[PDB]
Amino acid sequence: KKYHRIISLIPSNTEILYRLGIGEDIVGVSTVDDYPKDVKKGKKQFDAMNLNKEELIKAKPDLILAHESQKNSAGKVLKSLKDKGVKVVYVKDAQSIDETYDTFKSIGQLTDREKQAKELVDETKHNVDKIINSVPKHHKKQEVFMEVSSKPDIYTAGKDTFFNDMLEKLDAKNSFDDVKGWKSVSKESIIKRNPDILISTEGKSKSDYIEMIKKRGGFDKINAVKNTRIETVDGDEVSRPGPRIDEGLKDLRDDIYK
């Protein structure tokens, strides 16, 4: 009713729009949109990293719903669309579960689907709370190292990150709760922190991350390596700030609580 020709440039945006009941108002999505089934059919596809400005104009959108993470790449092109009077919105980059709920409401208010956004927030809370509640009442206080990059320097995720908020919701401890955002850490530093679980978020196969760990000097000692608590996750998938965050949280849960 409010916007009739929406272009959505990041999959989380697209998922939220569909859950608000306005998927039929979307004329374009990005080349990497994968949800729901057949989302790309009957739509224009845009490469958010290499946006075709003329093709965007040609699609005649009244709303382009982008993401804060894209200001520095897509922004270069979208500035033109905005000048032509197309409404261009950058949904904030959520780095927690509560901030994800925030964007549900923001997009709801933007598209006059406030009732639907409330329902979407409530249902998502329900699913999340179910995973949180599935954590065994008695458990050993476990320290988790999140490896978010590995070459040539290893990076972890400390406080103010999506991975950290997930840990806290799952009542686990972040080995590096003393740092903020994404920071490089030395091998010596990780060994000293002695995490009970290592989780790589780079989307590598488990066997590949296991082989890297084996080639790291000194890692032999670590709690996690001795107890074979070495896991991998696709960080971009599990931390996707959309309506299916409960599934991502569940993945992390099953790596922490075997």
Brief rundown of the structure:
The protein has helices spanning 11-19, 53-58, 75-83, 97-110, 114-133, 162-169, 187-193, 206-215, 223-226, 235-238, 245-256, and strands spanning 6-8, 26-30, 44-46, 63-67, 87-91, 143-149, 155-157, 173-174, 182-184, 197-200, 230-232.
Please explain how this structure is put together:
By secondary structure, the protein is α/β, with parallel strands linked by helices. The protein has 2 domains: 1-125, Nitrogenase molybdenum iron protein domain (Rossmann fold, 3-Layer(aba) Sandwich); 126-258, 3-Layer(aba) Sandwich (Rossmann fold), CATH 3.40.50. 40% of the residues lie in helices and 17% in strands. It has 11 helices and 11 strands. The protein has helices at residues 11-19, 53-58, 75-83, 97-110, 114-133, 162-169, 187-193, 206-215, 223-226, 235-238, 245-256, and strands spanning 6-8, 26-30, 44-46, 63-67, 87-91, 143-149, 155-157, 173-174, 182-184, 197-200, 230-232. The strands form 2 sheets. Strands 6, 7, 8, 9, 10 and 11 form a 6-stranded mixed β-sheet that branches. The chain has a 5-stranded parallel β-sheet with strand order 3-2-1-4-5, with helices on both faces. Helix 3 (75-83) links the parallel strand 4 (63-67) and strand 5 (87-91). The longest helix is centred in the middle third of the chain and has 20 residues, at 114-133. The chain starts with 5 loop residues before the first strand and ends with a helix.
